[PDB]
Amino acid sequence: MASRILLNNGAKMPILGLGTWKSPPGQVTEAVKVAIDVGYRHIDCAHVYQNENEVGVAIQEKLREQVVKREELFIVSKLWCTYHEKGLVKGACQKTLSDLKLDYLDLYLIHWPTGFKPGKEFFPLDESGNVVPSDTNILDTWAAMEELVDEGLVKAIGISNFNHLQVEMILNKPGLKYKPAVNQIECHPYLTQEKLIQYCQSKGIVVTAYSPLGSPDRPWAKPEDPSLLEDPRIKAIAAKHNKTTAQVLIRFPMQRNLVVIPKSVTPERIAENFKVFDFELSSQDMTTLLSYNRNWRVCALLSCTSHKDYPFHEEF
Ligand SMILES: NC(=O)c1ccc[n+]([C@@H]2O[C@H](COP(=O)([O-])OP(=O)(O)OC[C@H]3O[C@@H](n4cnc5c(N)ncnc54)[C@H](OP(=O)(O)O)[C@@H]3O)[C@@H](O)[C@H]2O)c1
Numbered sequence: 673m674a675s676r677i678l679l680n681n682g683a684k685m686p687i688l689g690l691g692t693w694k695s696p697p698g699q700v701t702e703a704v705k706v707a708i709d710v711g712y713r714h715i716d717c718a719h720v721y722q723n724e725n726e727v728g729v730a731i732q733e734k735l736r737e738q739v740v741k742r743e744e745l746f747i748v749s750k751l752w753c754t755y756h757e758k759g760l761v762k763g764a765c766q767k768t769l770s771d772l773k774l775d776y777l778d779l780y781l782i783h784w785p786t787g788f789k790p791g792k793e794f795f796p797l798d799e800s801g802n803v804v805p806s807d808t809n810i811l812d813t814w815a816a817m818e819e820l821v822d823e824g825l826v827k828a829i830g831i832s833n834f835n836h837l838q839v840e841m842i843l844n845k846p847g848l849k850y851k852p853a854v855n856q857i858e859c860h861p862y863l864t865q866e867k868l869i870q871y872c873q874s875k876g877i878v879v880t881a882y883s884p885l886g887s888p889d890r891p892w893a894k895p896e897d898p899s900l901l902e903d904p905r906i907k908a909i910a911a912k913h914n915k916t917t918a919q920v921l922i923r924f925p926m927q928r929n930l931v932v933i934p935k936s937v938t939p940e941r942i943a944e945n946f947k948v949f950d951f952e953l954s955s956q957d958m959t960t961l962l963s964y965n966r967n968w969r970v971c972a973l974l975s976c977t978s979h980k981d982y983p984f985h986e987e988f
């Protein structure tokens with residue numbers, strides 16, 4: 673299938689990218705170098721991942737080596753929750769640009785709808801363990817994101833972990849200048865997201881699926897949690913197609929017109945995960961994978977369940 677999807681800003685976005693959350697700083701430079709060498713053109717980043725400098729080393733080296741031109745890359749980062757204030761957005765973007773060695777981002781996302789008190793700590797807590805919110809309304813954060821487009825720092829802006837009412841709040845913003853190009857959300861066979869995906873696609877917003885393999889390295893994993901990569905039903909579909917379970921899990925969102933961002937620091941897996949443009953899941957396979965939904969979330973933002981903008985109380 674086609675390698676890129678057209679965004680509502682007129683630019684094309686590669687449907688397969690490399691994730692970088694949890695990629696160790698001493699391994700992510702080589703991971704991104706390998707990824708670019710084996711065909712990846714989209715890297716998903718974030719300031720909160722604390723490894724953008726090392727990602728940037730890889731990008732810059734492959735640009736210097738002329739393995740790829742800047743216009744061929746699609747680099748995404750995200751505004752962390754402690755920078756939702758109007759006066760902090762530009763500097764947060766600029767710090768990400770400096771770390772990544774870039775003079776623009778292809779896409780910059782509001783990482784979560786929840787703003788937190790600014791400061792050094794990424795999760796400021798009160799003495800009782802609750803996250804300390806910011807009063808900055810997300811519409812005002814959106815206006816600050818729009819300024820970045822108009823200053824040439826980013827080509828597109830979008831959102832992440834927004835529920836459908838929060839997307840709708842942006843779309844209904846008075847004086848809205850740029851619609852969100854993307855909503856990046858958790859999506860896999862155990863959290864299939866039919867309702868939110870349909871809503872976003874109907875508005876021309878492209879959906880990126882994160883944790884497509886179920887994030888087996890997530891720090892809060894428990895032994896009793898479900899495991900996509902070990903699910904015998906998914907292994908059976910993979911075996912039938914002579915592919916790995918990971919390859920099925922990556923191809924699944926692609927066939928839903930989603931972008932997908934599997935993470936790996938393992939060279940062989942980085943290459944394997946990209947080899948998903950040479951086979952097709954049947955409609956029956958797709959419906960079967962969808963049937964595994966259990967509304968199970970890797971990323972529930974649990975310290976934030978009383979924040980006014982916590983996204984996961986709503987059904988979708
Ligand atoms: N917007 C958000 O709030 C948000 C939240 C979560 C994730 N994300 C983004 O989405 C990306 C992907 O999600 P994720 O990191 O949570 O998890 P994931 O991509 O679902 O899974 C990554 C895990 O799978 C392993 N793996 C990768 N390819 C494999 C293969 N072929 N066979 C077996 N195991 C394989 C990796 O191991 P190795 O690395 O050791 O090879 C790692 O432990 C993130 O890195 C981040 O960029 C965004």
Ligand SMILES: C[S-](O)c1cccc(CNC(=O)c2ccc(F)cc2OCC(=O)O)c1
Binds near residue numbers: 693784982
């Ligand atoms: C549901 S509450 O809304 C929320 C809020 C906020 C957040 C949440 C979840 N996360 C975490 O934890 C985190 C941290 C750190 C890092 F580095 C990373 C991570 O993860 C991945 C992404 O991307 O995020 C939740």
